[PDB]
Amino acid sequence: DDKRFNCEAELTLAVIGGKWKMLILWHLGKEGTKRFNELKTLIPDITQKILVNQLRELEQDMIVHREVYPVVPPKVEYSLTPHGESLMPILEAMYEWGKGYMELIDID
């Protein structure tokens, strides 16, 4: 029970934690499917290497779908899986909470 709450809430933190995953997921959930360069533009502080590593981890974690489309020209699209989509209410609530908290700590 207590271990079940803790193992499970901590798993969630591990999946979305870090400096850029929440922002990647936010753009995919709010705006939809994106190519790599589109995400790279939306997140100007991120490097190619870091964005590739974060997307790879999100894909291996079954949060992001990466699909290759052999059309003319070929393209690779990134999107949320159903598991990713159900993180979106959590990210929304974290943003709303942190918006209010930041004002608290900033203005003091």
Add this chain to the structure above:
Amino acid sequence: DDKRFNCEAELTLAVIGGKWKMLILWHLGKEGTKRFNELKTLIPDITQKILVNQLRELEQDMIVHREVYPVVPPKVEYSLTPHGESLMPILEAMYEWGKGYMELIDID
């Protein structure tokens, strides 16, 4: 905007992150006010030193209220602040998400 979503969602992660804060907050929000020894019993894997450090950080972060009551015998009670209470829906949703995710990764 993008920096505002990111700064703010990341602040939230910093406040609740780690191995024991979510569990401390969960017990305080679900069960109410607790003394230190009560929390120590509810979280048997935690050490005195670690529980003192986590509660101190939660208090300094204005998530947990620590009140000394000079009654007979004196007592020190820990509870959530209003800012802590508004984390509870987020923790609830993280637990529900991670419960489903753990089943996904366990059963495979």
